[PDB]
Structure formats: structure tokens, C-alpha cells
Amino acid sequence: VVVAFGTPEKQILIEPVFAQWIQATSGKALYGFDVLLSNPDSIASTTGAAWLPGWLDAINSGTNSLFLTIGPG
């Protein structure tokens, strides 16, 4: 009803904050959460695990289908 009347600015867009935070915990730095594996200063990110570089490179390159960026929709 809001978009219909030529006033699309009153749409209730609520950010999927919890799921974006979960993505960030796996190293997603798009939303600037800097929590766990999105934070280089975190203990979980400085453990010397051979899977961290490739995982972060695949999850922070917006070219595949891994942890897709989400909006209010």
C-alpha cells in the first residue's frame, strides 16, 4: 500500500541484523561487524588453521553463491 500510492519511502524495511552478524562470524566483512572471524584481532581468527585464508577469500568475494548478502526482503 505504501509503494502503490507513489510514496515508496514509507516501507518498513528492517535489516536482517542477526543473520548478517552470523555471516560476519564466519569472516564476512561487508557489513563492518568485526566480530569473531571478521575481526583479525580475534582469538578465533589467529589460530593457524589452513582453512582460514581460502574460506575468507571465498566468503568475501561477492562473485559466488557463498553466504549471499541479504537485505530486508
Residues that bind other proteins (CB under 8 A): 2, 4-7, 10
User: What is the nearest approach in angstroms of other proteins to the Cβ of residue 73?
Assistant: 21
Output DSSP code: residue 42. Answer: S
Query: CA-CA-CA-CA torsion for 50, 56, 61, 65, nearest 10 degrees?
Result: 90
Among 24, 27, 37, 67, binds ligand CLA (CB under 6 A): 67
When the beta carbons of 14 and 50 are compared against ligand CLA, the nearer one is: 14
| Number of residues located near ligand CLA, criterion CB under 6 A | 10
Taking the complex as a whole, the smallest distance from the CB of residue 48 to other proteins amounts, in Å, to: 58
Distance CA 35, CA 73 (A): 24
